């Protein structure tokens, strides 16, 4: 995190912040709750109350990420609707504005499609986490039985050491202890192997999505040169638009670069 | 778009799709509507019914992108909650799992903060679009007056050419035509100059966010090597964790790279 | 298709569209359904509900193309009626108009006859498709039996592995598997050989019909020069018509060209 040695909510600015000052906080952060939905905030609480004790926090994480997934599909549909609206609105303006808006809407629709693919990959990762949630929830009854049986052993040996079930309960306890030891070993292996794999898949999806949107942004930034900021005096008017071929070539190149992109084609090199 | 010469919904696979087959569609795409909220789908319709005719589609786009912004802040809060839940859940597991989960939660919280910054930039871009929406909505009464006055001229010249207001209405029409010509010129300039600038700012925010999340993904992928997939037999147990310094160095390097990142530091080079 | 990189229903204009702007949409596209008939839209649904599962979409295609054929015979009868009506109406006008209308009606009747011949060829192609529909519908019971028998094998081997019918059912399954393999091979060969042949015959009929109507259109366009656009002042009147021989020669040449036309005589050379 970009925090600092301070007792205030202010954070340490970065190079981008120094070059570009941050905008004021969004006007869409209205004071209702930031909730999004009542079911959104109640599903998590319902999942975190019932079920096995061991599989409680993990179930909460699964439900929270399911809400993440729902909100992401909502924002993907919203963004594709915004692209459609921009494409529709581009008609009323000049030819150059119309073409630029159409290409920008195409790029935003492509971004929405990539978001949907990332949504599918995120659901795959969520199911991978659900598997470990289920196995830990199934493991929990073993240790619950172990503690119940050891409590019974302590109670019987305290109330009457010369009980008829003097050693049968102890032998059952030791075999349950062996079963619980095997269960704990397999739980550790599976949890730690599907955490490092589900999160690896999630990070692969993250980097692929980020690279694709970065390519989209770069190609749109290069396309935006066809639009002109030259202002016209009220009497005058521009000559006819002639940059159709340039826009066509740039969108063809964008599509080709997106198709060619692979895991090894990522230019991001962390240090 | 990655479409193909086909009459089916199937799309042309890319290099990543060929290398990695796509997962099945998400189980969170439940059949209610995909709506998200009733207000979400009614605000747009309300904005697209009233107001000036010219500033109707643009108002719909503004409202749709406001819904985009709300859903994005919702998903940012959801993701930060997921990071907090993962950090909390990391306690119950081994020391290495605890440390890895803590660092992953830190990275996800950083991603959420970057999402919030992108949300602020998106709201700035939305306000930039709102400015052109307002100016076109103010321009529309001029042309509405022009058409009303020309309709009155046609009606008067058809019903009785020798009307007392024979030429005063024509002179008022020509001065209104000059005003409308100036208005159309300034509307074209401002719309086409704030579209190429608001979208340029939006694409700058997009590429910055994408590069930052790509760096986060790469650093997390490099951090995930400290986690081990080696399985332990039920009897045995590992030696104590000793990779604290490696994780500390990798998160310090991630923070330094994020702070150092600037607009010119982007390694994405579109063709 | 002549689509474009756009999010609107507008299509990319062609050279003919640039030279000749497209007319407004037809006034005969009235809002009832575009149905044509209740039986037209219910026959397909009835065919697509019953019958073998494999021979379901193909039966729907056969029924839809039967409706195509019925509507084509309807339009051929309608066009021949239009030609008859034009020939009848030509009497009330001048001699040149009468002769031109008579020859145009002859050409339209010839076009209707060619449409009827194409209708017969289309029905032949539809019967060719019906043959493969029937063979796939007969093949489907084999695989249905195979799945039923393998389901029985799984059920018997799960409920009681030491069943009296331990291996007789397996041997019956393997012989059914051999029969189904032969059936699948022959189905693939026949389907893929009668698709490439029925569609080849259909395309031969298409190109022959198109060339014949193109020759008819060219000959009618050359005949329309006998009609004169010269306007007469109210007092004056033209001399008597004398272009009977020219029209006779042009229709004789049209008939000779239509008779001489063969498959190798087509001047259309695709690239």
Residue numbers in the entry:
A (entry chain J), B (entry chain D), C (entry chain K): 1 to 271
Publication excerpt:
The yeast eisosome, composed of the BAR-domain proteins Pil1 and Lsp1 (hereafter, Pil1/Lsp1), scaffolds a membrane compartment that senses and responds to mechanical stress by flattening and releasing sequestered factors. MCC–eisosomes are relatively stable, and have been implicated in sensing and responding to plasma membrane stress: various stimuli, including hypo-osmotic shock, heat shock and mechanical pressure, cause eisosomes to flatten and release sequestered proteins to affect signalling or transport functions. Here we isolated near-native eisosomes as helical tubules made up of a lattice of Pil1/Lsp1 bound to plasma membrane lipids, and solved their structures by helical reconstruction.
We isolated MCC–eisosomes from S. cerevisiae using a gentle purification procedure, preserving a lattice of untagged Pil1/Lsp1 structural proteins bound to a presumably intact plasma membrane bilayer in a near-native state, observable as a two-layer density in the protein tubule. Although MCC–eisosomes have been shown to have a furrow-like half-pipe structure in vivo, our isolated eisosome tubules seem to be closed, continuous helices of Pil1/Lsp1 proteins. Using a symmetry expansion and density subtraction strategy, we could refine our structures to a resolution of around 3.2 Å, which allowed us to build models of the paralogues Pil1 and Lsp1. With our improved resolution, we could characterize the lattice contact sites between Pil1 dimers in detail. Two novel structured regions of the protein were visible in our maps: (1) a folded N terminus (Nt) that forms lattice contact sites with the Nt of a neighbouring dimer, followed by (2) an Nt amphipathic helix (AH; residues 39–48) buried within the lipid density of the cytoplasmic leaflet of the bilayer that runs parallel to the BAR-domain helices of each Pil1/Lsp1 monomer. By making one-pixel slices through the unsharpened maps parallel to the axis of the eisosome tubule, we could clearly see the well-defined protein density of the AH buried in the cytoplasmic leaflet of the membrane, which is visible in these images as a uniform density of lower intensity (teal arrow). At slices around 5 Å deeper, an array of small voids in the membrane density begins to appear just below the AH. This pattern continues throughout the cytoplasmic leaflet, producing a fence-like striation in the membrane (violet arrows). Visualization of the electrostatic surface on the membrane-facing surface of the Pil1 dimer revealed two patches of intense positive charge adjacent to the AHs.
